[PDB]
Design a binder for this molecule. Sequence first.
Ligand code: NJM
Lengths: 99, 99
Amino acid sequence: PQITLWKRPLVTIKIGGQLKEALLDTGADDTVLEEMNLPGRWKPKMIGGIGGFIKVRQYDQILIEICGHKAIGTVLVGPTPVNIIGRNLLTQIGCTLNF
Amino acid sequence: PQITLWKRPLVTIKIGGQLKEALLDTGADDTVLEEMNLPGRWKPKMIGGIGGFIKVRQYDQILIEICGHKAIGTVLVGPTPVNIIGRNLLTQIGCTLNF
Ligand SMILES: CC(C)CN(C[C@@H](O)[C@H](Cc1ccccc1)NC(=O)O[C@H]1CO[C@H]2OCC[C@H]21)S(=O)(=O)c1ccc(CO)cc1
C-alpha cells in the first residue's frame, strides 16, 4: 500500500503474541518498542535523539509482522513514548520513500 | 525518486541560501535543524523527542529546497543531534511511504 504523511504513519504490528500500534519511521536506524516483557536474552544499550538518551534492552532475531508482512531482526525495548519501526525492519517489508 | 532504506535517507537541502545534509524522517512531525543563523523573526518553543524536551527557535514560512523540490513551512532550530525533515515538509514535496 501507499501511506501519505498528512498524519503520523501509524500501523498495526504483531510481536510476542501482541498487537500494537507503531510508527513507520525512516529516521530510526533500529526498531524501538514501548516497555514490554519479552522472554529470552538481551543486552543493554543506549540510543540517543532529541532530548538525549534512553536505556533500552536489545533483543535479537525477534519476529514482527507489519501490515501482514513478516520481518525478523533486532528489537530494542525501553521507555520510548511511541512504538517505532526502524529501517532494520522497514527494509525487510520492502518499504521505500517516493517523491 | 524511489529511496530504499538500507542506508540513512540523507539528502542535500538548501535553506537560507546554504546547503546542508538532512534526514528524511517520517517519524518526525516537525522539521528540526541544527544550530544555524536564519533571517527573519522567530519565537521560542519546546519539542520532545525520544530522550526528552529541547528548546528551539521556530521560523515560520521559511523557503527550503529538498532534492530540488521546493517547500515553504515551519523550521525549528535547536540542539538536535541530526538535521531532520519532518512530515510538515515531506507532505509539501509529495513524499509517501510505499511497500
Ligand atoms: C531524531 C532522529 C534522527 C532519530 N529518531 C527517530 C525520529 O523519527 C523520532 C521518533 C519519535 C520519538 C519520540 C516521539 C515521537 C517520534 N522523531 C522525533 O524526534 O520528532 C520530533 C520533531 O518532530 C516531532 O515529531 C515527533 C517527535 C518530534 S529517535 O526517536 O530519537 C531514535 C534514535 C535511535 C533508534 C535506534 O537506532 C530509534 C529511534
